[PDB]
Design a protein around this ligand. Structure first.
Ligand SMILES: Nc1nc2c(ncn2[C@@H]2O[C@H](COP(=O)(O)OP(=O)(O)OP(O)(O)=S)[C@@H](O)[C@H]2O)c(=O)[nH]1
Ligand SMILES: Nc1nc2c(ncn2[C@@H]2O[C@H](COP(=O)(O)OP(=O)(O)OP(O)(O)=S)[C@@H](O)[C@H]2O)c(=O)[nH]1
Ligand SMILES: Nc1nc2c(ncn2[C@@H]2O[C@H](COP(=O)(O)OP(=O)(O)OP(O)(O)=S)[C@@H](O)[C@H]2O)c(=O)[nH]1
Ligand SMILES: [Mg+2]
Ligand SMILES: [Mg+2]
Ligand SMILES: [Mg+2]
Lengths: 365, 375, 78, 384, 235, 321
């Protein structure tokens, strides 16, 4: 927890990077209750997932008139930047910001906007050190999936700790679309989740890495030791899963470290034949109760992902599975009975049930 | 059974494989009994992806009013809100007015535009306080079938569904999340009520599903070509169907006379498709095999001639375009030319040394003898 | 087509620009289609240029025909 | 002309110096009796920026004082041309006088309206008129083939994408697919939705370079619609009897005599050989044909403007010799051979060996200028 | 100079550092009596992103009552200069074309500054639409002897795709198929179909650099039109 | 060093090339030239670190903050010298606004180009500081960034010579003026041969005085003559606690190999030798920038690959014996 709680005020923000299967979305949804204690993410902690069709919606933008003929700048993320000083106007400002209904009361916008025009001089007439300290968190899931030079024009420079509210070298810039000039608070911190298996640098922006930190949180098989596994899933049915996972490993040969060493020996074979970002994460094995569901997640989730990885490359898939050239017997893929004119050799997918499926998983270790 | 377990455990199922296998058929067959309805519109919606879908027509986009523009909900947002408001019945006045606005297939009034826009303020305020042990069990079930899912830009279409479609991140899960949509500022989540089914073709690598993250959300079940169904006993059962009219029994002697002009080998079309598909797996990928649907409604020996010469031989001539030594190896006639063969070598020889064949329309008992020899 | 001029107009304006676009600057291949590969300086469609390239190149030229010399080039194809 | 009446359309192709565009324009002015574009005479030049929307039908944002004048499909140049012939040929039919003032007087004044006027009541009138034209556009197939002719010139057809700029026309421009043909076809258009067909009234003449193999007619099914008349470079034109014949017919201001004097001495200066220019071009052409493509041959248009010897010296050193250096860049020998000075490295040589060599051992040559009767001399050597 | 009166277009080839761009405008100023690139002596520098739409005609957004949805066809640099030369030349003419009310409106119009009025553009169209049928009915006798000569400089012509930037100018730039040649041609513009040709009093002077051979001019056909003069770096 | 030869040949060529390989003390001696005399320590104007990001619709184009963040220094390099008359002092009121401009008075903001059309032609040409350097120039395509830049910047084709040259741009014109005081060099280098001298015709605008990394920067009286610039908080003589031809037999023992068959302008920097102070940091000179940094560069070539040490499992030994 030491690298989790206060490795955030050093820089502006930080992105969680890793292959799929690593719960970066889950580990960003854990600090929302360990630091903000907001089980409902409506106030003081927001959650948006970026995608390739999001623009003029992380700032202020001219939207339609509130049920008229024909027209006002609607804000959608400055509402989380005007949300970070009371700890009557500002004291009630937060509800105007958290306006669940149409917040456009015939005059509610109006009260809100003027209150904004003062801020810029209420802080503009205020010194530095009183808000250098402050007693929020916005999560952008799949941050690489949106155009960072379109959702932010020239505004990701303003999230650094020096260019925020309470710094010596800190400024405010007039917002386009008739927005009072804006700046970012220092207590506003961004936790992002990124996928690196698609590309090692997916969002290839120079100003992204110079204002965000990166962490390569690895697939941890240590989370598959049966003892380790029960510590996740028990937090009337805390005991019904106990004999379920006990007889799971008992059919598996009473081995607690089975699914741990199955994953890491496969992932180290993928790391040789493919990139290191192509490792299989650990979430594919958390919802495993019986060997039937292990057989299901093997045959219907990770094997066609592996066949996608190596396509028509029977040798590579066989080697990663450790068939290692076995052409018959308990083999996931079995060589066909024909050989082509120029040396072509082919294999077919075989279904393995019973004890022949577990022992075929033993030869991959 | 493979489909109902995985659609309950993972929340999303993609059926993959070569064409001709029942991926689209088993999608309809699964939902016409779990809904007990043969027409979509209620508890059931069937769409089909292509490259002209968008996020704006799948979740929400700005559409003009016949008033400048308004945000209308896409097909997934209509059925996810329908699945949630149906599940909030048996778990009550205003949400009954909300369900009748979503099911209102006629267009909606401008007075009822902001009436519908006001009722989902109440619903998303409601589910933010209801505990995670009530929304997990909803007594109806909703199904959306996305046929040909790899023919559209899925990550652009599935805007916020990358985070939402996970089982524990649905409504009533251990990690239940509610995301604010960037259009209209409205909060949204997907219930555990709605189960999505996808169908895809593995033949086209151009449309291949290479997104690992999207792959984790769904469970992939492959419907393989099964030549076993082409056996006389099984093809008689596969043709014994909803057509239970006088032509039940009269179709079987047409099947009996057809195999009687094939040597009464009841495993002939099974061995024909099996020996062919294992040869396509060698010289090309496994995902270019012939599907069993090409040989289902064949009843006469002329009907097989229509299948063989007009569907699969022009398709095999496109796999191996101007590659005669490969296409005659699938038909086990590499060294055989100038005989009872599908392609006969032109007598002339190329100036620089080239040599090539011409397809011959083998008809009559000749046709069967060029098919047996493939076994 | 019904005249000998009409078949001369199909050959010299439609199919010979087609074959010279098929095998562009490939003279020994296109003369094999008319089986006149070793046959130069006659009633041929492509006559051999007397000039020869410095590093060994050889070129041809399209010859126009009319009358009884035309059909002998056609029976040469048969 | 014979191919134009039988195939319906002819693409003229060859090296650039041959007279392809000129023959096209001369033929059109003579047949139409119209020496100006418009009134049944159309000239266009295809380019990559050309589009199906521009040629046949596309949505055009036409802005007018009144709002919403835009957001209206605009028929393209070809469609306008097909219409303006169709219904002008519908202005005279034997005893099938259906309407006879609609097809003769509704939208000939609208389609050939030189003021591009979006008269919003009359624009709708255009549309109503077209639909009737189409139903009565099938009065009877037999009398369909009898109208007055119209013509369009597409220059540099290779430069544009014919497969895209021309769309449904690939099916239609075939002659029997036109109106009154043995297999008549009427097509449905995507944007406006109005039906469309080409008549035998409209003829299309195309111009094409084949020295550029990038813009080449690789569309083999598209070649079946057209007819290809290869105009080789006729060096026979550089002869004095023709050089005068093709250079004075239009102008009769007594400038013919001056040209006669100008070239009479010219030939006299050139060994009194009236074939000297012809030989230069022909020898050069055969030589170019061997070492490179035959379509990179020099055409006669470079040498038709020669009236004095000093005019021809500007043609060699500013048009012909810089063209040959682009054929063979740092390929000195091939240029040297085409001038029949293959190994010569001396005076009376266009390219001269540079003495130094690369550490890698490479060698180079230098172009040298030549002038006077002395320069006239090197030309004959290429012959030898 | 003599090559401009015969070929029409000259291209001053040479490597970088040669006096190619400088004498391109040194010869231009002394043959138009205009020190500044005003009516004549216009200057254009190509680049790799230069387009056909900027050169002849294209769709551009314009503000009519500050509404940006109005997209109207904008005439390019060449269209404007070619039109200006022709209109000034038509200033001297017989009775059919003697009346200069319309001619002066059009010429001043091209001569005008950047602003194009919502109410100015339509008058330009009326005059231009007239202008085609007037010169279409005018004989080819007076049209070859246009007195005021216009000139255009194209710098760095190797940078752009000249075969794409030149459109219909593959045809119209030859001297015998300008307005008043033996084979006079007039073409229809692509956007909305307006008639257009080049009068003989407009002359183009290019400037090429042979270092970038790969995207240097490769269209052999385009070469016949223009004349070529090598410029070696004479010290 | 080089601080006494450069200040005498500025009005001849305008821009001079003093080339060097990447990594060495080059990106500070560039910052040396702008801070020492004028001491302009403010951004936005005349003191901006500048390396382009190779993204260009690209003499000036690439529209939308309109065209470029620093696309108007060529006028301003003489405009402050051409201000000695509301016309004379209106340029500076808008350009000292670091804010986006309002649409309330847009027509008044772009109406000022009207008077100076023929005044700058009537301006005396000998009436004549600001520095904008291009970095990351040859990393991307230099032919894309070089439009009409090569002919305009030479010796006599400025305005201070006899050869007269104006500029031309579309979209409402706006021709500007050119001084010889302008400082736009651009880093000329060959760290990648794919783009290096792609425009081989570069003759009459530059020269080549090679700036090798100075080998005399390793002596005990010459190591940290340069290395004290950064110190501010009492660090001038903390390094007098551990000093009690030292390490010169490290550089020319390696950087004479860089020239023979090795590529010359892939040299290693001495900016990493900035603050060698303690006794623990004596591992980074033989095991970090000597042996592994020169190992995996030849094509499995032992001579290039095995030449790591001048002063399988990787062997371990510490440098005291
Ligand atoms: N308790 C716990 N559950 C985990 C952990 N990692 C994965 N999980 C399980 O799987 C999920 C992990 O988050 P996950 O969905 O894998 O991250 P993600 O960022 O969405 O993954 P992706 O979107 O980048 S493919 C959780 O919902 C939980 O069910 C972990 O470290 N702890
Ligand atoms: N009864 C029965 N019919 C089947 C079965 N598999 C396929 N069919 C029949 O095959 C035909 C086509 O099957 P279908 O599911 O539509 O292929 P597909 O999924 O579209 O394949 P594609 O999408 O890759 S082109 C239909 O007539 C269908 O009923 C099966 O298992 N049982
Ligand atoms: N009078 C006359 N002139 C001819 C003849 N052949 C060519 N010319 C002249 O040659 C020149 C070019 O001919 P033209 O037909 O315009 O070439 P083109 O097809 O346009 O050439 P391209 O470069 O675009 S591929 C013109 O001056 C033309 O008049 C001919 O037979 N008679
Ligand atoms: Mg995630
Ligand atoms: Mg299907
Ligand atoms: Mg032409």
């Amino acid at each position: 927890y030491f690298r989790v709680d206060m490795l955030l005020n050093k820089k502006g923000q930080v992105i969680l990077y890793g292959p799929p299967g690593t719960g970066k979305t889950w580990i960003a949804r854990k600090y929302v209750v360990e630091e903000t204690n907001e089980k409902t993410p409506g106030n003081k902690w927001e959650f948006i997932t970026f995608h390739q069709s999001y623009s003029y919606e992380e700032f202020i933008e001219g939207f339609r008139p509130r049920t008229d003929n024909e027209i006002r700048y609607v804000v959608e993320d400055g509402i989380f930047k005007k949300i970070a000083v009371k700890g009557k106007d500002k004291i009630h400002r937060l509800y105007i910001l958290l306006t669940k209904k149409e917040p456009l009361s015939p005059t509610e916008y109006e009260e809100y906007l003027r209150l904004k025009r003062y801020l810029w001089e209420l802080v503009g007439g205020l010194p530095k050190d009183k808000l250098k300290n402050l007693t929020f968190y916005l999560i952008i899931d799949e941050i690489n999936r949106g155009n960072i030079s379109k959702i932010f024009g020239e505004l990701i420079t303003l999230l650094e700790k020096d260019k925020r509210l309470g710094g010596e070298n800190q400024l405010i810039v007039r917002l386009p679309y008739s927005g009072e000039p804006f700046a970012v608070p220092p207590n506003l911190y961004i936790i992002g989740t990124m996928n690196t298996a698609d590309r090692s640098i997916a969002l290839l922006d120079v100003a992204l890495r110079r204002r965000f930190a990166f962490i390569e949180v690895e697939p941890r098989p240590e989370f598959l030791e049966k003892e380790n596994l029960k510590k996740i899933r028990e937090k009337e049915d805390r005991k019904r899963l106990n004999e379920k996972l006990n007889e799971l490993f008992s059919k598996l040969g009473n081995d607690n470290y089975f699914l741990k060493t199955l994953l890491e020996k496969i992932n180290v074979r993928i790391t040789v034949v493919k990139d290191r970002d192509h490792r299989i994460g650990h979430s594919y094995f958390l919802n495993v109760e019986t060997v039937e569901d292990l057989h299901h997640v093997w045959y219907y989730e990770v094997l066609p992902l592996l066949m996608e990885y190596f396509y028509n490359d029977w040798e590579t898939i066989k080697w990663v599975l450790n068939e290692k050239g076995k052409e018959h017997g308990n083999v996931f893929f079995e060589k066909l009975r024909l050989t082509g004119p120029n040396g072509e050799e082919a294999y077919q997918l075989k279904v393995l049930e019973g004890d022949a499926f577990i022992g075929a998983l033993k030869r991959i270790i």
